[PDB]
Amino acid sequence: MNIFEMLRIDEGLRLKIYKDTEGYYTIGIGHLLTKSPSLNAAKSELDKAIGRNCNGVITKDEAEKLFNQDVDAAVRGILRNAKLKLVYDSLDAVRRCALINMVFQMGETGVAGFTNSLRMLQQKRWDEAAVNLAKSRWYNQTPNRAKRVITTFRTGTWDAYKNL
Known about the structure:
This protein is mainly alpha-helical. It has helices at residues 3-11, 39-50, 60-80, 82-90, 93-112, 115-122, 126-133, 137-141, 143-155; strands at 14-19, 25-28, 31-34.
Protein backbone atom coordinates (compact mmCIF):
# COMPACT_ATOMS: atom_id res chain seq x y z
CA MET A 1 0.00 0.00 0.00
CA ASN A 2 1.30 3.49 -0.77
CA ILE A 3 0.08 7.10 -0.64
CA PHE A 4 -1.61 6.86 -4.01
CA GLU A 5 -3.63 3.72 -3.26
CA MET A 6 -4.56 5.07 0.13
CA LEU A 7 -5.94 8.32 -1.25
CA ARG A 8 -7.66 6.58 -4.17
CA ILE A 9 -9.57 4.55 -1.56
CA ASP A 10 -10.51 7.64 0.48
CA GLU A 11 -11.50 9.98 -2.30
CA GLY A 12 -12.77 7.70 -5.12
CA LEU A 13 -12.55 8.51 -8.83
CA ARG A 14 -15.24 10.45 -10.68
CA LEU A 15 -14.87 11.57 -14.30
CA LYS A 16 -17.70 14.13 -14.24
CA ILE A 17 -17.87 17.37 -12.08
CA TYR A 18 -19.38 16.46 -8.74
CA LYS A 19 -20.01 18.03 -5.30
CA ASP A 20 -17.84 16.91 -2.49
CA THR A 21 -18.93 16.18 1.04
CA GLU A 22 -18.84 19.89 1.72
CA GLY A 23 -20.87 20.66 -1.35
CA TYR A 24 -17.95 21.97 -3.36
CA TYR A 25 -17.32 21.41 -7.10
CA THR A 26 -14.69 18.62 -7.51
CA ILE A 27 -13.60 16.18 -10.14
CA GLY A 28 -11.25 13.21 -10.44
CA ILE A 29 -9.60 11.93 -7.37
CA GLY A 30 -10.60 14.58 -4.88
CA HIS A 31 -9.38 17.58 -6.91
CA LEU A 32 -11.28 20.60 -5.58
CA LEU A 33 -12.18 22.94 -8.40
CA THR A 34 -13.74 25.95 -6.61
CA LYS A 35 -15.59 26.79 -3.43
CA SER A 36 -17.93 28.96 -5.57
CA PRO A 37 -21.47 27.98 -6.09
CA SER A 38 -21.48 28.45 -9.79
CA LEU A 39 -21.15 25.26 -11.90
CA ASN A 40 -20.03 27.74 -14.47
CA ALA A 41 -17.21 28.96 -12.37
CA ALA A 42 -16.30 25.22 -11.92
CA LYS A 43 -16.34 24.37 -15.57
CA SER A 44 -13.97 27.28 -16.20
CA GLU A 45 -11.54 26.26 -13.51
CA LEU A 46 -11.65 22.75 -14.99
CA ASP A 47 -10.79 23.83 -18.50
CA LYS A 48 -8.02 25.99 -17.06
CA ALA A 49 -6.63 23.04 -15.09
CA ILE A 50 -6.68 20.56 -18.00
CA GLY A 51 -5.87 22.90 -20.82
CA ARG A 52 -8.82 21.93 -23.00
CA ASN A 53 -12.55 22.47 -23.29
CA CYS A 54 -13.81 19.70 -21.19
CA ASN A 55 -17.47 20.53 -20.89
CA GLY A 56 -17.41 19.11 -17.30
CA VAL A 57 -15.89 15.86 -18.20
CA ILE A 58 -12.35 14.35 -18.13
CA THR A 59 -10.60 11.07 -18.98
CA LYS A 60 -8.96 8.65 -16.56
CA ASP A 61 -5.55 9.81 -17.70
CA GLU A 62 -6.42 13.45 -16.91
CA ALA A 63 -7.67 12.58 -13.47
CA GLU A 64 -4.53 10.70 -12.72
CA LYS A 65 -2.40 13.58 -13.88
CA LEU A 66 -4.25 16.02 -11.55
CA PHE A 67 -3.85 13.42 -8.77
CA ASN A 68 -0.03 13.22 -9.34
CA GLN A 69 0.16 16.99 -9.16
CA ASP A 70 -1.94 17.21 -6.02
CA VAL A 71 0.05 14.60 -4.09
CA ASP A 72 3.26 16.30 -5.13
CA ALA A 73 1.99 19.65 -3.98
CA ALA A 74 0.72 18.12 -0.70
CA VAL A 75 4.25 16.73 0.05
CA ARG A 76 6.01 20.02 -1.02
CA GLY A 77 3.62 21.94 1.13
CA ILE A 78 4.44 19.89 4.24
CA LEU A 79 8.21 20.31 3.51
CA ARG A 80 7.73 24.08 3.30
CA ASN A 81 5.80 24.48 6.39
CA ALA A 82 8.07 24.66 9.51
CA LYS A 83 5.62 23.08 11.95
CA LEU A 84 4.62 20.41 9.50
CA LYS A 85 8.14 19.42 8.40
CA LEU A 86 9.22 18.92 12.00
CA VAL A 87 6.48 16.38 12.50
CA TYR A 88 6.96 14.78 9.08
CA ASP A 89 10.64 14.25 9.61
CA SER A 90 10.01 12.65 13.00
CA LEU A 91 7.63 10.03 11.67
CA ASP A 92 8.04 6.49 10.19
CA ALA A 93 7.01 5.78 6.56
CA VAL A 94 3.46 4.63 7.23
CA ARG A 95 2.59 7.50 9.58
CA ARG A 96 4.06 9.93 7.00
CA CYS A 97 1.32 8.70 4.65
CA ALA A 98 -1.36 9.58 7.21
CA LEU A 99 -0.15 13.22 7.50
CA ILE A 100 -0.01 13.56 3.76
CA ASN A 101 -3.63 12.31 3.50
CA MET A 102 -4.76 15.00 6.04
CA VAL A 103 -2.93 17.71 4.09
CA PHE A 104 -4.43 16.61 0.79
CA GLN A 105 -7.97 16.73 2.33
CA MET A 106 -7.73 19.79 4.41
CA GLY A 107 -4.84 21.90 3.25
CA GLU A 108 -1.65 22.83 4.98
CA THR A 109 -3.19 25.59 6.93
CA GLY A 110 -5.93 23.49 8.22
CA VAL A 111 -3.64 20.69 9.40
CA ALA A 112 -1.18 23.14 10.88
CA GLY A 113 -4.07 24.31 13.10
CA PHE A 114 -4.07 20.85 14.85
CA THR A 115 -1.42 22.18 17.28
CA ASN A 116 -1.88 19.80 20.14
CA SER A 117 -2.26 16.63 18.05
CA LEU A 118 0.92 17.51 16.04
CA ARG A 119 2.84 17.86 19.39
CA MET A 120 1.58 14.47 20.49
CA LEU A 121 2.52 12.80 17.23
CA GLN A 122 6.03 14.38 17.42
CA GLN A 123 6.30 12.93 20.88
CA LYS A 124 5.20 9.52 19.63
CA ARG A 125 2.22 9.42 22.05
CA TRP A 126 0.07 7.43 19.58
CA ASP A 127 -2.98 6.72 21.74
CA GLU A 128 -3.18 10.16 23.04
CA ALA A 129 -2.85 11.80 19.72
CA ALA A 130 -5.63 9.55 18.27
CA VAL A 131 -8.00 10.59 21.01
CA ASN A 132 -7.15 14.30 20.41
CA LEU A 133 -7.52 14.08 16.62
CA ALA A 134 -11.08 12.71 17.01
CA LYS A 135 -12.18 15.95 18.86
CA SER A 136 -12.50 17.84 15.61
CA ARG A 137 -15.09 18.99 13.07
CA TRP A 138 -13.03 16.79 10.63
CA TYR A 139 -13.83 13.60 12.53
CA ASN A 140 -17.50 14.54 13.06
CA GLN A 141 -18.06 15.41 9.38
CA THR A 142 -16.26 12.46 7.73
CA PRO A 143 -15.98 9.87 10.46
CA ASN A 144 -15.17 6.72 8.44
CA ARG A 145 -12.33 8.33 6.57
CA ALA A 146 -11.03 10.14 9.73
CA LYS A 147 -11.12 6.79 11.65
CA ARG A 148 -9.07 5.20 8.87
CA VAL A 149 -6.38 7.95 9.10
CA ILE A 150 -6.48 7.99 12.86
CA THR A 151 -5.92 4.22 13.05
CA THR A 152 -3.01 4.66 10.68
CA PHE A 153 -1.34 7.13 13.09
CA ARG A 154 -2.33 4.99 16.05
CA THR A 155 -0.82 1.71 14.73
CA GLY A 156 1.71 2.62 12.18
CA THR A 157 0.30 -0.14 9.92
CA TRP A 158 -2.10 -0.29 6.98
CA ASP A 159 -4.67 -2.34 8.67
CA ALA A 160 -7.55 0.17 8.27
CA TYR A 161 -7.16 -0.01 4.56
CA LYS A 162 -6.59 -3.80 4.15
CA ASN A 163 -10.08 -4.33 4.41
CA LEU A 164 -11.11 -1.86 1.66
